[PDB]
Amino acid sequence: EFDAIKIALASPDMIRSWSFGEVKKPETINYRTFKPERDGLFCARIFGPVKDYECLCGKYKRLKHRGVICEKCGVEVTQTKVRRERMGHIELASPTAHIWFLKSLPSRIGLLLDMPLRDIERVLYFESYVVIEGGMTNLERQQILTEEQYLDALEEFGDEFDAKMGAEAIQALLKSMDLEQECEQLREELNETNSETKRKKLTKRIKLLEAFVQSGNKPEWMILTVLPVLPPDLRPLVPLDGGRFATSDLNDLYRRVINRNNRLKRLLDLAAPDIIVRNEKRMLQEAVDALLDNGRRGRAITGSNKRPLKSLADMIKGKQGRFRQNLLGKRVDYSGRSVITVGPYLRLHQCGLPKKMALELFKPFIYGKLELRGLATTIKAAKKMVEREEAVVWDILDEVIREHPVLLNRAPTLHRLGIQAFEPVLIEGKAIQLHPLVCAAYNADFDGDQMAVHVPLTLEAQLEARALMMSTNNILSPANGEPIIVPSQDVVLGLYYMTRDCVNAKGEGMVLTGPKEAERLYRSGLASLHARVKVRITEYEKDANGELVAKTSLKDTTVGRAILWMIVPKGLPYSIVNQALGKKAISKMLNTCYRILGLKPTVIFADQIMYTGFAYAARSGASVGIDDMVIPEKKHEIISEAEAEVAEIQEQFQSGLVTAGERYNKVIDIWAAANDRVSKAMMDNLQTETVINRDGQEEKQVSFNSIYMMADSGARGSAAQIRQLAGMRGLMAKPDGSIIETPITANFREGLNVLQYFISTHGARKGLADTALKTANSGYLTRRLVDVAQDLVVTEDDCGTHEGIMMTPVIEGGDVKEPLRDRVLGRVTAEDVLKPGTADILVPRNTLLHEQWCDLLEENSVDAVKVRSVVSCDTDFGVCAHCYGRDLARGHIINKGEAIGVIAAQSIGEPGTQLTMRSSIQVKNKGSIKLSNVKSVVNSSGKLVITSRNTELKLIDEFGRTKESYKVPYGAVLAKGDGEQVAGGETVANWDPHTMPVITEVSGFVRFTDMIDGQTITRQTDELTGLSSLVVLDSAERTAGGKDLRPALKIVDAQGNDVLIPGTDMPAQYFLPGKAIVQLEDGVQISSGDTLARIPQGGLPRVADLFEARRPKEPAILAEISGIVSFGKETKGKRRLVITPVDGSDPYEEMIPKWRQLNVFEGERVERGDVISDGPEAPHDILRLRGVHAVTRYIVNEVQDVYRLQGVKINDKHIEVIVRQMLRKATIVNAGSSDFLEGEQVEYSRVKIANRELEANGKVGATYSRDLLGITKASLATESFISAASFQETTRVLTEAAVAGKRDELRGLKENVIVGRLIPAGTGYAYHQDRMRRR
Template sequence: MTPPIPKFINRRFDKKGLGKLISWAFTNYGTARTADLADNLKNLGFKFATRGAVSISVEDLQVPESKVEILDQAEQEIQRAEARYTRGEITEVERFQKVIDTWANATDELTEGVKKNFQDNNPLNSVGMMAFSGARGNLSQVRQLVGMRGLMADPQGQIIDLPIKANFREGLNVTEYIISSYGARKGLVDTALRTADSGYLTRRLVDVSQDVIVREDDCGTQRGIFLGSLRDGDKMIVALGDRLTGRVAARDVVHPVTRELICPRNSLFDGDLVAKITAAQVEEVMVRSPLTCEANRSVCRLCYGWSLAHSHLVDIGEAVGIIAAQSIGEPGTQLTMRTFHTGGVFTGEVAKPLKAAFPATIKFSSTLRARPMRTRHGDEAFQVDQMGTITLDGPGSKKETITLTQGSLLMVEDGQKIEKGTMFAELALVGKTSRKSTEKAQKEVFSDLAGEVKFDNLVPEVKTDRQGNETQYASRLGLLWVLSGAVYNLPPGAETTLDRNDKIEEGGVLAETRLITEHGGVVRLKDQDTKAGREVEIITASVLLDKAIVHEEKSQGRETYHLETDNGQSFSLKVSPGTKVTNGQVVAERVDDRYITKSGGIIKYAGVEVAKAKGKQGFEVLKGGTLLWIPEETHEVNKDISLLEVEDGQYVEAGTQVVKDIYCLTTGVVSVTQRNDILREVVIKSGELHMLDSLSDLKVPHESLAHPGTEVIPGLIVEELKYIEQVETPEGLAVLLRSVEEFTVPDEPDAPSQEASHQGASIRLKGVQRIPYRHDDRVKSIDGVELMKTQLVLEITDQAAQLAADIELVTDEKNPDLTRLQLVILETLLIRRDLEEDLLHGATLTEPLVHAGDQIAPGAVVARTEILVKKGGGGIVRGISKVGSTARRILLVTDADKVAIKTTGEPVAKAGDLVRAGDPLTTETLATESGQVLVVEGGRAVIRIGRPYLVSGGAILMVEDTDLIQRGDNLALLVFERAKTGDIIQGLPRVEELLEGRKPKEMCMLVERPGEVSVTLMPDETYQVTVKEDDGNVTNYSIMGQSIIVSDGQQVQAGEPITDGPSNPHDILRVFSEREGLQKGIQQVQRYLVNEVQQVYRSQGVEIHDKHIEIIVRQMTSKVRVEDGGDTTFLPGELVELRQIEQVNEAMEVTGGAPARCTPVLLGITKASLNTDSFISAASFQETTRVLTEAAIEGKSDWLRGLKENVIIGRLIPAGTGFNAYEEAEEVIEDDELIDDSLGLRTVGVVYAGDDELVDDEDED
């Protein structure tokens, strides 16, 4: 076929035109000549760009003249909105929305201006040429260069209502620069994160699809998928022709009208055929697809279609899997991760504004039904309930008729005359609205002035939630006024003597607070003041050790204190000065070595009586006596028994090695404790050893005390107290006489002398003796232990026991060199310093009423603080807000809060009325300020300044009627609906979520069975959706916190969503396969995944052919889970290829065995990669150890089908010319035919790499 002769084309070429030209050349003339053409075009372009000096200079950046006018108009519109807001005609939300929309429209208008400016005034402007030809930059970038930068979002994604009016040519001021850097930073961070994310996505995709290779010509399947054109509402996104190109027909295509055959099954759709189909207006065509290809573990040529590289049918051996993975992964860097939300309420996508092209009169058609409503800008308008038309009747014969869809807004009335350029309607776009979901948002309203709250036409209603918390709501639209006044906050405990309507002058006392002592005592004033004020200490009780001296020692940077008493005792302080001690706490411990032993041993009480002490402080001695101590040396070893160097019962000298590296310090008998061949401890018991002939010789019981003069064995009388123990020695039975040490314990310890002074509570230091061990305790130790401690303990009597005492060191009055120890119980009161900032709330004046050394009674007043009216703030008390019986805030109305207006004419308003700026006061005078009228008479009116806030119905009220508030207090939370932005996952994360088969956040609920819907609101604010089937079966769905997208009486099909949000692909698979069978379920989820992934890429302007995504999705849905193995060899829970199960089940039908039952599973790409048949590929992807150990345990073999496994072990890869079908093809394979054996293992006329080759390798080694 000869290529067509090129036509002469003479027009401007942009990026698209060039693309078409090169594509035409490529299709008709092949690669070499196209490359040559492209080269020539490049040279041509550079040559003339150089001659024409195409570059960007400052001179090229021309700001359109219309900018000033557009900005002026926007400013005026916003001022009007602000004025309406100040008058209380629109709410804060409506004002904000109006500002955002006004600026967005201004930006759009300016963009048009920029475009027009370049096209009309200077079509050869370099910047214009680059942007419009698609060479570099786009319209929005050019707009920022020469138009205005526009609105920016803050880091939370909310739009800041201060637009950047400048462009880069004029330069930004500091504020604008800071605002614009939010978005810029976001963009940079996003780019950095994106590269890593998209790289990892590519790696996972390659891993899951690397073994998909075209292995046969035709799999012979009858199945396919239906393709139609893609639309969103009325807008065509992708035409059917573009989707068909390069595919193969799965059925004959016939003309929808004449029924003649356009093309038979298995025809390839090329340009000509697609043109025929488009001309015949075929709605949908069934095509073959990798999703339905029945080739085993591969794709056949016909199901794949064109290789997109050269517009011919794909070749056998082409690694289409890797091409698919890279086609999806590579554009990943172009997808944003988080879009910058359109913050705020619906943007322009939802409604299309209609403006009059000429002055006209409006006429409604008779079918049009509309009801009044409030727009999102707070304007009055009509919403269309029933479709109809309106006609614009212009001058002369000019006429325009417009059809208004349901949900559109009308800004005009029937018969109204409008000017040119007036917006008269907003057209609701069909199809768009269904996809946008909304969420409830809240906006706070803060007060601009301090004063008193007054509800005007605002009806609060109280709702109680499940926890019993009450919230006040506004039941309908109403005004909340704040009437100006000076509000004084009173500190806790302040009392006022004033009443309503009292007059008070500047400097008068509003209220006073008193500082009162609780316990009374002696006053002590601190010398220096702290930041907060002056501390007053009141000493309730104190004790001074008048005869004891405190010494301070420093060791290793720490201070220790010692107390020496007059009778020569020494105590060490256990608490440091400046700290607090509580009742029963140890203050000091006596230093003496009278009760320290030389080693461990056994303790016995003789006449000593003890009680358990508080905490873990041993036992307190109640009555004195003697402590008996039988010493023994204990070594805790915990080593192997083989290290023992002596025997149990052996008598050893001091210094003997008893265990390796352990030597004893005393002489005596060894006792060994062991358990499970582990040596626990070795005890050396000192004493005299006497051999026994028989047990009966022992006159004293084992383990008892023998007093002096007692006969122990015949001929042996003890002269001092001994402890008798019989022992087994290697030589035989013996008796050990162990020495006993005695320690005397007095009844009462000596406490140092002390003098105390107190009021109410008394306080003293008490001496206490404590023994850490019980009677008969064995103390295991090598070194000595302390058997008894003498301590000084704080004792506070009476009701003050819960108070704490302060430890203080004071110098002696007579001898300043000596330091004494004093314990005092203090009450510390803080007298506030009068601070500068208090003047905001009115001046405070604080005066102390006591002096140092005063003795005061409990309940006495220590200081008094007066709250005074601030400078120039005299006025009339108008409100006292109380909590209980105490006043919290006082409101004064001063002269500054009132405004006087000269009036003429008859009064219209009366005292007490609330008027807004611009309302009439008299027949001839308007109010200049909003507020409450105080008087209107005698030619003047006085208004108390106020500020109205419009509150929408359903808003949460944070204040009550007549509350007193400060400026900046929160008045209400306005509740409104806005387009949901925050949680829509977009861009790369959404692609990843889909391909990994994850459950989406906030997913929608799907209908399990078809039927008719009814929706009911339950008492706990949740919705119950009931679906009633034709046969009367009822399914209930309970829904919390999601918006419902079905309505009463609607018919729904299985798998349809009830609520908004993304679907969970696993649910789709389950619902459809339960109802309509395995194949149908898999088909539905495949379609869903392909469309959703495509939608993400398309929304960012990236085009990927469906077949690439289909190959990946095929890999995700190729496995099923065995539920019941039947008579096959499959195990329950095993993941098996669907094709394999189908083949085995066919064989079972023939042999009459029970087939295997299975359910479909959707595996994410990571899971699918780890579940491939090839363990080498899976191990080289992730979790290497786990994959390899499992493969080894199961005894898997790797058939080396994919590319990766072959690369890893260093063989030729089975793709392209290395594809197995070509090896020794002439011997085995006729007509490029591949043979499948029953298990689906390839037998392609060659033994895989030949077993003998492997043997040869080993021989060479």
């Protein structure tokens, strides 16, 4: 029916076109009778039939009279629906400014005129005059006048010269403005002002002008004259219980505004003095804006309860304006809600449902089939049949819920598994029964969680339910390929109890031919369950073309392993069950079952292991007891020696031999050590306490204590929690955030004292309070970045490109903390895998890497693969599938259509709750030594020192892969060198953190050049040795008389010649900064690598500040461009630099906060994007200097370290893709044959097709520069204004787009749900292939 949404500012006669009348009287209803009046608010003859096809007086009572108006009041007969939308106007007397354009900050009126807003406010509230059309005066056409200086003007140019006040003057002055002279003139003044302030203000000026004329508006419409009134039924008058009436605010202030207007009219009739009508016009001004946006004016207004009433502006904004309140989230029919419970006897493709809720939810279906069978003809018969509960209907809703799916919902619906579908089985009773394996996916414990259900009505949605929403579909997480239908807690207890063995039992080590006999031995009770017996089993495998082959042997095993072997389907190896089967082993068991045997055997296998899980768990009889928790007997003695040790350090403080913090730290360390002694004390006491005979004397084995099974199997808890049970619990923190010196010596099996418990409840309250406010922030994070992505749809097959990023296994600096094969798994490569067989192609360039390929290059020890990423996908308005890869819940390629931006958003969002709250180089393992960006020199001692900070120490193994990474300091004494072999566990470096060395590289003399004692340096003898040294000060301590003098230690030989820099023909001067202590005196001939001077010295919102992309506290300063450097002018707010590039010019220099201890030196020649000092590495310059791939790789390494610190998995594509939504905008560097302004921001896709088809022309396109934006304002910088209108600051984007005249073809999602059509993501992507294909 209709395309794009267009807005514009409102013309006056447009508003006259909208109305059907003028409101004139401030009443609304009778109150005496109950009638609506002639031309009040609730009007009939303006707004229409309050009754239905009937007049007010009831003149035309039938449907026959339809078409003619009445005459006793004059109302047209139509439906009563028509009073919902017929608008009305009011004609105000004196004009009135619209405050959105007045106080959007920046004001459109304000910078449109370029007069300060304070003066406009002085004109508006009548305390000042201002002159239109100055002309022949000594006084300008836009000058404000005070009233005594208007008395002055009243004297002198009190002639034909004119000056007015208020919104009349604003309409007049703003009306008489010519626009084109402003355009050309301000383009000219943009050509004049060298100041970037004036260039900025004038370019905003020229933006609003040249956009203002370009849209078909008029300036003078911005002063409101004819106010539209809202249709009456949307501002309804309801009664409360009794004769009173719950008012609306809107009706109240409409009453106020037309009372105001009419009184002003009669005052103009009576010719009152200017004081009165002045005051009244000011009252009308506050009246009108009090209608528009109450509260943005300096004091709001209240009607009753002294509580500020609601205008129209807050009716849109905020948590209950229409966008988030009634447009994205609506209340729905056909729903029910109650409390969940289990009922484990269900299969997982079905759920329980109560008979009452079923008989309520499906009532129209009952009507339909009940009409079909003819048990009752007419409808109201069926009404009383479904009311009175006759026995036939239980057959009927028994029938119609045969294959009709339903949906379930749990309220904190974080990630998309919170909605799954089931097939209802009717239940006696009235709670909802639920299959157990769904609970972990819902995170819904049975502590009293309620769930809600829904019913898809139509046919296609039933197919969407069974097709996609059905719970058998989703078994893998969208976050990662791990199964989410892992058994939760007690079935793993049962199976862990199944596959175990005490060392001597009934039927110890007999033989058996097949697991059925083992079942007969168990249920006959002739052998124990945990008892080992060599049996015969037989298995299958599909090595061939999926071909299953029988083969068999006599495995030695337990009984119970052979028992649950019967449940396993055909294609498995045996040794999947030949162990104790912890939670991890059964999890990857199910995983490989999915990888090898497809879908359905994994499904029915999972149900069956649930059944035997509860069977043998119940038959097991796993209790707990007070006698089960065992106190280690050594606990008392370890605590005893510990308190002796704090008595020893304490008496060191009694006579004061030690300080406070030293006693503090030693005491807290020995409590840490003794605490650990108690920890492995109780572990060694528990884990293997069972010592028994075995047809012989004695033997130890693992413990049958209930706790150790419950923690060992992975059911609940860990060594930490049982550590808090048996052994002592912890060292609790203090409210300061520091740590208390006396640990909680007791444990929960014994009694805590008073104060240990008191300290503990401090820690607990601080904990769950943090959970409350942390939840509050995490929801806001997801709420934000779901909006900034929102729109990215996999829409094409293959971009056909060769760009992308380079995946490597990451190393923290110690162990590999994330290998290669998971960062690579399931992402199609960029180029082909050259095998490290030299010139062999292992894997071709466009292949999916499933597990076989990953094993293939896994064997050949490939270290790096360039891969296709979504940041490099060349697709306009989308992403090709061959740049994205796998579904991660559907084990294949991604299909065409899946809007993966939101699953990225939920995917990073759901761990937001579970985030946490509260030298030298020593190698470990053995390999070859590798260094990179090395600028080294052999010292006098045979060691190695490196004068480049950017050198990195790596450990290549004996195969070729890197296994360690270490920073090489500027001038660190290395014990070894590059390409060398070391042994694991060897120190290979040395430096001082308490010395920045000013070391050398050559041999010769060092002369005291410019080391003048008192201006640059100072005489500071060493009071400990006697070797006095001339200490070089910094700028702020030395006086200005020799501050421009740079003390240098320049390398000369025995002849004094410039010992040049090795390689070039520049002298080797060592300019001396602050805290540089020149120990080696004058005339001292130096060695290599010797210090000529010595210079000594996070949580969730970290992540939110990374996608916020903030400038950090001080940025690490970096090199804009390659070339040499020097220094700049002394202390000008800061001391400056001077940078001199080699080949091109040297436009770049900068004041530097000299708290930044510099890293580079003057003779150093560097590359762009390289460090000058260090600190936090600001992202914008990584974009603008090191490029696109660098900044993305920086981001994903950063936040991947954050989540990976907590051990919370997320595959890397999601961070990639929302970054591609971050850096979508760009700016212009040159137009070329483009038509854009150079100083203009535009999205990169639109300029990419712009020059891309200017490339189709002979002409050159444009040159661009990309930007990254914080997501909370990147979403505001979007072409679809409704999308930003659903986000924050609705007023700002609404006015700005409103004066823009901007158009919106909707090309996206939440606007397509905001308008109510097919979403263009899933099936509606095929529908928009259709509607796109027509036009």
